[PDB]
């Protein structure tokens, strides 16, 4: 697959993030996060 | 709670029927209003789909209606004489539907001279009107409606129920 | 989901059946006795389909569509000639006919391998291709159209590397 | 002939068929259940502790003592005789071990020469007799 677009305006906003880090551009919440219910 | 459900009861063939589930809030009965007389008060009731069945507990007045002349006045209910279902409704003066209760009819008497002085009237009703307590039937559902009103007792009906009282 | 491609035989120790099945394996250069029994089971689904079609009327909507479609698929595979293309001749056919259409044997007829066994070796070691496309698999079934297009893949035969 | 053949007569045929199944012994054995009151309990394999070692002998014409262990089962707490196959093998089993028992392979009934017992010992101590008899596994 592949596709081509006018300008830089597409891949900034339309693309997923996993292609941007690859090309060139952790359960913490589950644990640390639910302490905000346990503590007020 | 009190259930409206019928699965537990026996079939037509007379078979001991068995539950497969708990009681359920589709088929919830509630207690009777037992709608007596004297002091107006009402209890609001949430039901299926939001909404309000305004259940009437004890009612003084009722919006009664002379049918033949087309006229209908807010009138004070005094007592239950008769009810076709139960004599227990007569003893505690419970307003149900089909409840034969006398009314003062002060408004109706006023209506006759303010209109006339047409009219004509029946010979059974003038034997009633000198006392000033008309027989009449509750046609509303006091418990569901929250309001009780009924037409005056007249014609061939007025012969029938008068024998049941006497 | 899934399916059972070969079936086991009914009686294990019959002399005539075992003595038959060795000289189908020997001629066509084959691994096991199960690699026959799949081709027996492939011949069953052809013929069970065919016979049912035969029972139907000679004009029925099912026979006209299916009968033309069935013979079209076997003229690809190169079992039925255009002389024999008439539906009853489907109830014929042997495993010896249907084994002959496989890639192993079509290399041999071609003679590139030089032996039935050699043909298997050429295909199992990535030497043979079918229209610029490598075929590792030694039971391809070639469609007569493409039978002409059997040729060396590249490696030792073309590359010449040790 | 010898049965109802008529168009409307399907109640007679269906109901008469249900009766005649109770003559058949396989339908009778499955349905009665009737299988629960069994040492096996309908299970192909059972395990438990050895009580001791017993010599039970063959009927006739075969003169031979067979060597079947007595074994208490785990789940029922019953006791039952059980044959030990291969020569030696009674010596390999040891006293008061756990063993896995299975059936004689005759789908019930009593098999060869050997009456009474309907059971053979497949494993001992989580190993298997064939391995032990052959001696490609060990016991302490």
């Amino acid at each position: 697959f592949g596709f081509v677009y006018d300008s830089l305006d597409a891949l900034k906003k339309t693309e997923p993030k996993h292609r941007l880090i690859k090309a060139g551009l952790r359960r913490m919440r589950k644990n640390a996060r639910r302490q905000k219910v346990k503590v007020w | 709670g009190i259930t409206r459900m019928g699965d537990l009861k026996h079939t037509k063939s007379g078979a001991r029927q068995v539950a497969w589930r708990k009681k359920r809030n589709f088929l919830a009965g509630r207690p009777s209003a037992q709608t007596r007389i004297g002091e107006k008060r009402i209890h609001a009731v949430r039901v299926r789909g939001g909404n309000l069945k305004m259940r009437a507990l004890r009612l003084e007045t009722g919006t009664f209606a002379w049918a033949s002349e087309n006229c209908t006045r807010k009138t004070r209910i005094l007592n239950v004489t008769y009810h076709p279902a139960d004599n227990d409704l007569v003893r505690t003066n419970t307003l149900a539907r089909g409840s034969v209760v006398s009314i003062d009819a002060a408004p109706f008497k006023q209506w006759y001279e303010r209109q006339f002085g047409g009219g004509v009237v029946a010979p059974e009703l003038v034997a009633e009107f000198d006392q000033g307590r008309l027989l009449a039937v509750i046609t509303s559902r006091p418990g569901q409606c929250g309001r009780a009103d009924g037409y005056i007792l007249e014609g061939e009906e007025l012969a029938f129920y008068s024998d049941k009282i006497a | 989901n899934f399916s059972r491609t070969f079936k086991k035989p009914m009686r294990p120790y019959e002399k005539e059946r075992m003595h038959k099945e060795l000289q189908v394996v020997g001629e066509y250069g084959l691994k096991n006795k199960r690699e026959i029994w799949r081709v027996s089971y492939t011949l069953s689904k052809i013929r069970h389909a065919a016979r049912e079609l035969l029972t139907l009327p000679e004009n029925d909507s099912k026979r006209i569509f299916e009968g033309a479609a069935l013979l079209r698929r076997l003229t690809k595979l190169g079992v039925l000639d255009e002389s024999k293309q008439k539906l009853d001749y489907v109830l014929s056919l042997t495993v010896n006919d249907l084994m002959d259409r496989r890639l192993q044997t079509q290399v041999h007829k071609r003679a590139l391998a030089n032996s039935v066994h050699h043909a298997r070796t050429l295909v199992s070691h990535r030497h043979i291709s079918v229209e610029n496309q490598l075929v590792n698999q030694p039971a391809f079934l070639v469609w007569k159209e493409s039978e002409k297009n059997i040729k060396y893949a590249d490696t030792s035969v073309m590359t010449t590397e040790k | 002939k010898s049965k109802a053949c008529g168009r409307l007569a399907a109640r007679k045929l269906r109901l008469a068929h249900k009766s005649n199944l109770w003559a058949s012994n396989a339908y009778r054995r499955s349905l009665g259940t009737s299988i629960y009151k069994t040492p096996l309990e309908g299970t192909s394999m059972a395990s438990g502790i050895v009580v001791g070692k017993v010599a039970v002998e063959a009927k006739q014409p075969n003169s031979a003592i067979r060597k079947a262990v007595r074994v208490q089962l785990k789940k029922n707490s019953k006791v039952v005789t059980a044959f030990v196959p291969r020569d030696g093998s009674l010596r390999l089993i040891d006293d008061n071990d756990r063993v896995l028992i299975a059936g004689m392979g005759r789908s019930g009934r009593s098999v060869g020469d050997l009456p009474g017992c309907r059971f053979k010992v497949i494993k001992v101590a989580g190993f298997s007799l064939l391995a032990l008899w052959l001696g490609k596994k060990e016991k302490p």
């Binding site: 697959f1 339309t14 | 359920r24 | 006209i64 569509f65 | -």
Partner: protein
């Protein structure tokens, strides 16, 4: 006991849509709307697996929320909104106008069309009743309550509907000798000229005819009276509901 449930599975999703058995378990549950679950087609699916613009479902929910798409005049930012039979689809940016409409076989297809045609749409009368001051009014297969509708507007009549203003310009009457596309059952997606109408006592049947000269019935509720006598009021697909037959 069952409640109104969110998670539609594939398999249980309808056979209109041409979904893969693979590519996950769940399909996109349509939102509540004008059209039913079974007949409709969402606009999540419309952009994934017809026009093929949005490859992922993340990308499909992007472009509806940019507000390029317009269902039937209105914008619709909600997505997964059920759109089915005679709905116009105006699309912003590289704009194209569609009308959603059945194939030969029963499947949905998508059809580029002229802009002057793609103003209006058709609307069959399902239910006629009186309400508020003796006024007759009509529900449609959408659920557009067309009040102050004219006379000669009975059940199973189509209404041409101008979209910019809430008008009903024509009224194509139900009769013998009138073209009708079937929209449910086995004969779904088929054009026919109406030869016979058979009244059914209690709960009726209608016999039809292709240009080829096949013949087939259906229940009355399935037929959608598309236009008066051969020539319809609409651009039809390739083949024109005829259906192949060898």
């Amino acid at each position: 006991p069952r409640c109104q449930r969110f998670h539609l599975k594939r398999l249980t999703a309808p056979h209109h849509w041409l979904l893969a058995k693979s590519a996950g378990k769940f399909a996109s549950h349509p939102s509540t709307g004008p059209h039913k679950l079974r007949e409709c087609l969402p606009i999540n699916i419309f952009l994934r697996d017809r026009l093929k613009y949005a490859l992922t479902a993340k990308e499909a929910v992007a472009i509806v929320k940019r507000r390029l798409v317009k269902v039937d005049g209105k914008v619709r930012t909600n997505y997964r909104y059920p759109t089915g039979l005679m709905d116009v689809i105006g699309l912003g940016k590289s704009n194209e106008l569609f009308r959603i409409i059945y194939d030969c076989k029963g499947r949905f297809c998508v059809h580029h069309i002229e802009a002057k045609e793609a103003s209006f749409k058709l609307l069959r009368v399902n239910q006629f009743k009186i309400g508020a001051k003796g006024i007759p009014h009509v529900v449609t297969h959408d659920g557009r309550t067309i009040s102050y509708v004219d006379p000669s507007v009975r059940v199973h009549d189509a209404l041409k509907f101008n979209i910019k203003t809430g008008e009903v310009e024509s009224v194509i009457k139900f009769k013998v000798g009138d073209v009708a596309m079937v929209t449910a059952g086995g004969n779904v997606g088929r054009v026919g000229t109406i030869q016979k109408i058979e009244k059914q006592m209690a709960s009726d049947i209608v016999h039809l005819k292709d240009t080829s000269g096949a013949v087939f019935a259906t229940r009355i509720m399935n037929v959608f009276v598309i236009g008066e006598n051969e020539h319809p009021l609409i651009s039809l697909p390739a083949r024109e509901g005829v259906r192949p037959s060898i």
